[PDB]
Structures are given as C-alpha cells and as structure tokens.
Enzyme design. Structure first.
Site, PDB file in Angstrom:
ATOM      1  N   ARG A  45       0.833  -1.186   0.000  1.00 31.61           N
ATOM      2  CA  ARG A  45       0.000   0.000   0.000  1.00 31.61           C
ATOM      3  C   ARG A  45       0.874   1.243   0.000  1.00 31.61           C
ATOM      4  NH1 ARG A  45      -4.555  -0.370   4.041  1.00 31.61           N
ATOM      5  NH2 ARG A  45      -3.272   0.602   5.667  1.00 31.61           N
ATOM      6  N   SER A  49      -2.794   4.490  -3.336  1.00 29.19           N
ATOM      7  CA  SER A  49      -3.381   3.241  -3.829  1.00 29.19           C
ATOM      8  C   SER A  49      -2.921   2.013  -3.042  1.00 29.19           C
ATOM      9  CB  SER A  49      -3.023   3.051  -5.308  1.00 29.19           C
ATOM     10  OG  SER A  49      -1.640   2.774  -5.461  1.00 29.19           O
ATOM     11  N   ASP A 154      10.011   8.501 -11.822  1.00 30.47           N
ATOM     12  CA  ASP A 154      10.074   7.755 -10.568  1.00 30.47           C
ATOM     13  C   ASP A 154      10.928   6.485 -10.716  1.00 30.47           C
ATOM     14  OD1 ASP A 154       9.712   7.458  -7.819  1.00 30.47           O
ATOM     15  OD2 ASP A 154       7.695   6.537  -8.011  1.00 30.47           O
TER      16      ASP A 154
END
Ligand SMILES: NC(=O)c1cc(CNCCCCOCCNc2nc3cc(C(N)=O)ccc3c3cnccc23)cc(OC(F)(F)F)c1
Length: 327
Positions: A45, A49, A154
């Site tokens: 988690r 999301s 990312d």
C-alpha cells in the site's frame, strides 16, 4: 529569472503527434468487467493506492490490480493514457484492463503479473554480467518511453521488476509519468528522495527526460559500489549536500549559474566547500568484482549536475560498458 531549457533529444515528439496522443483529459476510458478478477493477496500500500495479486477467472492467469484511493480516483487518465501509448514497448509493464472496484467504488488498473525472484537478498547477489544485462534492459524501456515523449519521473529499484528465472525485466508504476512539452514548467515534487536529480533539489522546473538518467545513475552507483543508497540524504536539503560531497561544489555553482537558478538561502549554512572526488574512492575489495573502467566511465557520464550534459538513454546504449552483453 531562470534561464529556459529544452531536451537535446525528442524535443518535439508531442508537438508533431496528434492531440489525441498527449491530451489525456479528453481520453474516454473504456471500462472492463470487475467480475473477471478475484483478489488473492495484498502486495503493498502506498499514499494513493493499494496493489493486490489477483486471478483473471476468464483465463486462470495471475494479474496485479492497483486499486486507487478515493483521493487519487479523479487523476487516472494521465496514467491510463501513458500506459496505453506505451503498451507493447520493450520492457514496459502491460496494462491488461481498467475496471471499477465494487467495494472502494474507485478505478482499478489491472496489470501483467511478473514472477518475483525475492528482493531480500537476490538483488544484492547479482553478478557484474547480470548488472550490465539488466541495466541494458532498463535502457530499452527508457529510450522507448523518452522516444514516445514520456518521462517516467520515478525510476528506482521499487519500480523495476525482475523475474531472474526467465531474465525478464519490467519498468512499472507509471503514476508519476508525464508527457514532455518543451518550455513546460513541471512539479519538482517527483521521484523518491535518494533518486531525485539536482534539478529537483534546486527547484528548477524546466526539466526533461534527463531526470530519469540521473535516477538510473543513482541505481547503477548503488549496485556497482554495494552502497545502498549511494546518496543517502536525511531530507531534500541534505540530499543535495550528499551529492555535493561527491561531485563537488564548484560544478554545482557552475550549474546553478548557467541556468540563473538562485539556491534556497537555507543551503548557505549546510552546503560548505567540497572538491570533486575521483570514482576509485568508492572501490574496495568487496565491490571490485562489479567495478571496471567502463562502469566508472559510464557512471561518470550519468551523474552530472547539468541535466543537458548527461548521456541520453540512446547514447548510454552505445557505451562500452554494454559491449560484453549478448545482443
Ligand atoms: N538495487 C536493487 O536492489 C534493485 C532491486 C530490484 C528489484 N526491485 C523489485 C521491487 C518489487 C516491488 O514490488 C511491488 C509490488 N508488486 C507489484 N507491483 C506492480 C505494480 C504495477 C504498477 N503500479 O504499475 C504493475 C505491476 C506490478 C506487479 C506485477 N507482478 C508482480 C508484482 C507486482 C531491481 C533492480 O534493478 C536493476 F538495477 F535492474 F537490477 C535493482
């Protein structure tokens, strides 16, 4: 004020592509059937999301479902459009479906599942050959998405899946990815702390695909030197100081001066004066097998303050470090 910058490659990909390609807000999401998927177990988690291992009951295949939290539910079209635009590209994770979860009442992206080969120690016992092999695999994904006008923003170990049994790599989590438009100012609050480029740390918004190449350089340095993370900042400010202790302050000031960037005055009490260190300072008997003159030369051309002076993904693929990799 700040001097403008533009990418030295794929500058105009989005300009010459139809508006349908990059106008994600106009995209009409086609909804699949949530009844096709059964959740099996929680995989993790994040802030926006939760991800689960799941089974598609129509073909008995394993899939991974990302269920968005109610806050990020409105912001899904950008990620969806990027995933559809890149689908089928080399080593890019495949988006299999888009459904509405019946419990959360939020969107759920269904992805291709990759057999995981354990991260507790397996990505620490990679050989020098394996490091080159997987780095070339990541470069295929980055050159592909950059050639398609997309920056990932990312790149980090947590977003690189490896099925070592089948020598398979997938670059995942396109949730921070964005379309590159020259002259556009972007949010600098992207990428994970240890992988943030100097452009983000100095608050320079006109960045481009080269941000991914700095993040890749951080990954490479950690693997070949067995120093994880390579630049271990305590916060976003100390992150820049950690980098300056390796690359030196003179080139950092040359960088900010070139783009007429005024450093945050809070750096005056922490930055100091540091010389550029030679890469062999990080070599020792426990990592020497992963280090070669080609690895150091390649790393040196990725970890540069000036985002315009770093190797592009295509140029990186031309580097001598990858000559030993079977193609
Ligand atoms: N330095 C190092 O130690 C290192 C470590 C690694 C290994 N990192 C593993 C990180 C696992 C994180 O798992 C997240 C949860 N599971 C899944 N998440 C998903 C999310 C999405 C999505 N959101 O797009 C889509 C699909 C999946 C998915 C699909 N199949 C199975 C599970 C998943 C590589 C490395 O790169 C290298 F450099 F090339 F070697 C370096």
């Amino acid at each position: 004020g700040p001097v403008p910058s533009r990418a030295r490659v794929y500058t105009d990909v989005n300009t010459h592509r139809p508006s349908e390609y990059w106008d994600y807000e106009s995209h009409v999401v086609e909804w699949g059937n949530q009844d096709d998927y059964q959740l099996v177990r929680k995989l993790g988690r994040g802030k926006y999301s939760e991800v689960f291992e799941a089974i598609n009951i129509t073909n008995n295949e394993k899939v991974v479902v990302k269920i968005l939290k109610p806050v990020a539910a409105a912001k899904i079209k950008r990620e969806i459009k990027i995933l559809e635009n890149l689908r089928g590209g080399p080593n890019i994770i495949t988006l299999a479906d888009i459904v509405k979860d019946p419990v959360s009442r939020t969107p759920a992206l269904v992805f291709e599942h990759v057999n995981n080969t354990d991260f507790k120690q397996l990505y620490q016992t990679l050989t020098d050959y394996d490091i080159r092999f997987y780095m070339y695999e990541i470069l295929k994904a980055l050159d592909y998405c950059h050639s398609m006008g997309i920056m990932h923003r990312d790149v980090k170990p947590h977003n690189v899946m490896i099925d070592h049994e089948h020598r398979k790599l997938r670059l995942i989590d396109w949730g921070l990815a964005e379309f590159y438009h020259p002259g556009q100012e972007y949010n600098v609050r992207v990428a994970s702390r240890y992988f943030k480029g100097p452009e983000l740390l100095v608050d320079y918004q006109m960045y481009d695909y080269s941000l991914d190449m700095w993040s890749l350089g951080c990954m490479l340095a950690s693997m070949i030197f067995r120093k994880e993370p390579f630049f271990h900042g305590h916060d976003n400010y100390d992150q820049l100081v950690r980098i300056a202790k390796v690359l030196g302050t003179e080139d950092l000031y040359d960088y900010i001066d070139k783009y007429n960037i005024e450093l945050d005055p809070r750096f005056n009490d922490i930055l100091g004066r540091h010389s550029r260190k030679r890469w062999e300072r990080f070599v020792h008997s426990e990592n020497q097998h992963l280090v070669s003159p080609e690895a150091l030369d390649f790393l040196d051309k990725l970890l540069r303050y000036d985002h315009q002076s770093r190797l592009t993904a295509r140029e990186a693929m031309e580097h001598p470090y990858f000559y030993t990799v079977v193609k």
